[PDB]
Design an enzyme around this catalytic site. Structure first.
Site, mmCIF file in Angstrom:
data_model
loop_
_atom_site.group_PDB
_atom_site.id
_atom_site.type_symbol
_atom_site.label_atom_id
_atom_site.label_comp_id
_atom_site.label_asym_id
_atom_site.label_seq_id
_atom_site.Cartn_x
_atom_site.Cartn_y
_atom_site.Cartn_z
ATOM 1 N N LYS A 42 33.105 37.208 41.140
ATOM 2 C CA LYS A 42 34.477 37.782 41.687
ATOM 3 C C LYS A 42 35.779 37.281 41.259
ATOM 4 O O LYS A 42 36.686 37.984 41.229
ATOM 5 C CB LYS A 42 34.251 37.740 43.350
ATOM 6 C CG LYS A 42 33.635 38.828 44.012
ATOM 7 C CD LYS A 42 33.261 38.482 45.347
ATOM 8 C CE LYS A 42 34.701 38.170 46.194
ATOM 9 N NZ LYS A 42 34.247 37.810 47.953
ATOM 10 N N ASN A 43 35.684 36.275 40.980
ATOM 11 C CA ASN A 43 36.865 35.224 40.383
ATOM 12 C C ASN A 43 37.001 35.524 38.947
ATOM 13 O O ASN A 43 38.170 35.620 38.569
ATOM 14 C CB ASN A 43 36.466 33.865 40.452
ATOM 15 C CG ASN A 43 36.771 33.192 42.064
ATOM 16 O OD1 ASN A 43 37.410 34.194 42.597
ATOM 17 N ND2 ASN A 43 36.397 32.012 42.156
HETATM 18 N N1 LIG Z 1 37.665 32.253 36.263
HETATM 19 C C1 LIG Z 1 39.011 32.218 36.752
HETATM 20 N N2 LIG Z 1 39.971 32.279 35.956
HETATM 21 C C2 LIG Z 1 41.245 31.842 36.399
HETATM 22 N N3 LIG Z 1 41.510 31.574 37.656
HETATM 23 C C3 LIG Z 1 40.304 31.457 38.680
HETATM 24 C C4 LIG Z 1 39.018 31.612 38.138
HETATM 25 N N4 LIG Z 1 38.303 31.353 38.966
HETATM 26 C C5 LIG Z 1 39.022 31.016 40.249
HETATM 27 N N5 LIG Z 1 40.473 30.841 39.844
HETATM 28 C C6 LIG Z 1 41.720 30.822 40.649
HETATM 29 O O1 LIG Z 1 41.177 29.711 41.826
HETATM 30 C C7 LIG Z 1 41.720 30.408 43.011
HETATM 31 C C8 LIG Z 1 40.816 30.114 43.979
HETATM 32 O O2 LIG Z 1 39.326 30.435 43.892
HETATM 33 P P1 LIG Z 1 38.297 31.005 44.982
HETATM 34 O O3 LIG Z 1 37.360 29.830 45.659
HETATM 35 O O4 LIG Z 1 37.372 31.861 44.360
HETATM 36 O O5 LIG Z 1 39.358 31.527 46.079
HETATM 37 P P2 LIG Z 1 39.787 32.973 46.363
HETATM 38 O O6 LIG Z 1 39.073 34.198 45.458
HETATM 39 O O7 LIG Z 1 39.675 33.323 47.717
HETATM 40 O O8 LIG Z 1 41.563 33.086 45.834
HETATM 41 C C9 LIG Z 1 41.854 31.751 42.724
HETATM 42 O O9 LIG Z 1 43.047 32.458 43.485
HETATM 43 C C10 LIG Z 1 42.072 31.824 41.093
HETATM 44 O O10 LIG Z 1 43.759 31.892 41.052
HETATM 45 MG MG LIG Z 2 36.848 33.480 45.455
#
Ligand SMILES: Nc1ncnc2c1ncn2[C@@H]1O[C@H](COP(=O)(O)OP(=O)(O)O)[C@@H](O)[C@H]1O
Ligand SMILES: [Mg+2]
Ligand SMILES: Nc1ncnc2c1ncn2[C@@H]1O[C@H](COP(=O)(O)OP(=O)(O)O)[C@@H](O)[C@H]1O
Ligand SMILES: [Mg+2]
EC number: 2.7.11.2
Lengths: 339, 336
Positions: A228-229
């Site tokens: 999802k990220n």
């Molecule tokens: N693969 C990725 N590339 C760039 N940023 C990422 C990636 N993985 C996560 N992040 C960053 O870290 C933040 C927090 O991650 P996450 O736990 O998935 O929280 P959420 O999806 O609710 O924001 C995201 O909002 C994003 O900005």
């Molecule tokens: Mg997330």
């Protein structure tokens, strides 16, 4: 039961320390019900009083949140309900069917403990000592391990899996299933998502598919959250929905580790901000994925059986999420907050 | 060489001061003049020396009393005493300046072997790690300062600093050198593949303001490990996996990744790799020193970066050097 004794009840079970179960101890239940009871009726009160003890440890400004109590309210009821049984005959059909019944009730009751705790941390009155991190890692590792215990019972007694545990789990299938789910959300929102590529390198078996002893739901949870990220990062970083870089997965089996790398070209993150990414307080998303707990919690899931989850980025290019698991059942041991 | 009987007092004095890290632009700012250099070096150099020497004695009686160690210490004492002579000489005087650079040269040649000398000292065998990181970090910093004055004061570069440093170019030079050592040892070594994604402008060669030798050394150290790990992991010389380099330029970071298919290392061992006490090769070609990784990471930190290793056991490993892309963020970091 009498709910005034609850103070006294926690002070008592809190004097005990969690007793981690190995995968072989988990696997060897075909053991018996009176085994799962006898042990569960002491173990869960021990696990629940330990973490409730840490719940009146919270900042008086988050402790007072409604959502917070709600979840505390659930735990005081879920300790009593299991204390009703600390005297019953482990030898009659109903003590046993009554327990499973109680367990069903507690697991359904706590199914929104995170979206709820998440509302006690969202609605919270600012920012200097967010010691909400420390407790929440501990609160959530304890939660996973209790849900482990409950599910095993509830499943075993209510592929060919022994509870929530699959003894021959196809990493790839889990990865594909989790990609599919994640992708469905992406498309329903951005109407675009990157593709998927899977790779395997079995060091232990040069040509045999990678399988393992693990809980597929836990793996699915990690992989889903991460996908999802990665699809969000990818989409937000490009312009044309016809040339979105695929997400690449790499599965490596070694003699000691089972490694899964999820690589994206989502633009990456400065080295300055990588620790941040795990902040329960941090999310780069239009608030209420966007509830910023996806990453710390997934890592808590990896650490639960002696694993870990780490993110490595290249700003301007992309990011590497790697999940580290123990290759050998022998090494997969329950991890818990200090006990 | 002042009388070495005042040595105890001199350290405690300049050890009362704190190092002052220079920005990359302050280094570039010396085209101010020499007199400024001389006047700042003759205060700064003793400060950094006495600071680290005072910790040399914080070492365990076991290792300090090692001839290799005591031998390095004797050097620092002499260097401190050499510099101290210029504390009351006329900055505005022609001789005093060319005498200072004459002295810095002597010190620089005298310290040229401090690392392998410290190493033979560790051989005389673990908080040692804490000291050594700081010792070697301070040393890179003192070598920075010495080289700026000697090179600046005696071809587009501002000392060891190249304002238009081509990352790929250094990467190539480091691959070839390293490559040379390997072949002469294994008579087989990976090929090399380089890629760049200039995020900040999309089809231009990534350049930076940096110290080419510092970048060289990091990439040099890492290349040897990956080509070794790769040789050690395979059985065929005609099918050896190339080493892949990714150069990424973003708003804040300048990222270099070296990926190899050398079979990698379990997660349990990653910390170890940066141990001065750890090496998977003999005490001695290509390997055996066991400090290639920790110092390399020190070079990266020096101007505010970092060096990180990520592996997948059974497959290979990623080595990544992170730097600041902007000169405005590159100020030297230093131990107390
Ligand atoms: N693969 C990725 N590339 C760039 N940023 C990422 C990636 N993985 C996560 N992040 C960053 O870290 C933040 C927090 O991650 P996450 O736990 O998935 O929280 P959420 O999806 O609710 O924001 C995201 O909002 C994003 O900005
Ligand atoms: Mg997330
Ligand atoms: N790319 C790599 N793949 C696997 N192992 C590595 C790699 N990089 C370094 N290592 C391990 O870490 C150890 C120490 O690294 P280093 O500082 O280069 O020391 P040295 O080369 O003197 O042993 C090596 O001996 C090796 O076993
Ligand atoms: Mg080395």
């Amino acid at each position: 039961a009498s709910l005034a004794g609850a103070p006294k009840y926690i002070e008592h079970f809190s004097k005990f320390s969690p007793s981690p179960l190995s995968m072989k101890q988990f696997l060897d239940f075909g053991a018996c019900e009176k085994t799962s009871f006898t042990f569960l009726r002491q173990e869960l009160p021990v696990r629940l009083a330990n973490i409730m003890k840490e719940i009146n440890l919270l900042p008086d400004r988050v402790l007072s949140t409604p959502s917070v109590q709600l979840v505390q309210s659930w735990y005081v009821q879920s300790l009593l309900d299991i204390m009703e049984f600390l005297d019953k005959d482990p030898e009659d059909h109903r003590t046993l069917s009554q327990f499973t019944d109680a367990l069903v009730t507690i697991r359904n009751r706590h199914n929104d403990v995170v979206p709820t705790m998440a509302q006690g941390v969202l609605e919270y009155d600012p920012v200097s000592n967010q010691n909400i991190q420390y407790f929440l890692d501990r609160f959530y590792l304890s939660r996973i391990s209790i849900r482990m215990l409950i599910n095993q019972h509830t499943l075993i007694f209510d592929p060919k899996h022994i509870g929530s545990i699959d003894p021959n789990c196809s990493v790839s299938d889990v990865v594909k299933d989790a990609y599919d789910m994640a992708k469905l959300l992406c498309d329903k929102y951005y109407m675009a998502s990157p593709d998927l590529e899977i790779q395997e390198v079995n060091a232990t078996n040069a040509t045999q598919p990678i399988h393992m002893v693990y809980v597929p739901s836990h793996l699915y949870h990690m992989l889903f959250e991460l996908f999802k990220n990665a699809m969000r990062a990818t989409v937000e970083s490009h312009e044309s929905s016809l040339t979105l870089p695929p997400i690449k997965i790499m599965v490596a089996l070694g003699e000691e580790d089972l490694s899964i790398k999820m690589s994206d070209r989502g633009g990456g993150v400065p080295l300055r901000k990588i620790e941040r990414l795990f902040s329960y307080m941090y999310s780069t998303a239009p608030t209420p994925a966007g509830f910023g707990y996806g990453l710390p919690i997934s890592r808590l899931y990896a650490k639960y059986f002696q694993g870990d989850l780490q993110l490595f980025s290249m700003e301007g290019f992309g990011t590497d999420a790697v999940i580290y698991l123990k290759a050998l059942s022998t090494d997969s041991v329950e991890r818990l907050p200090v006990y």
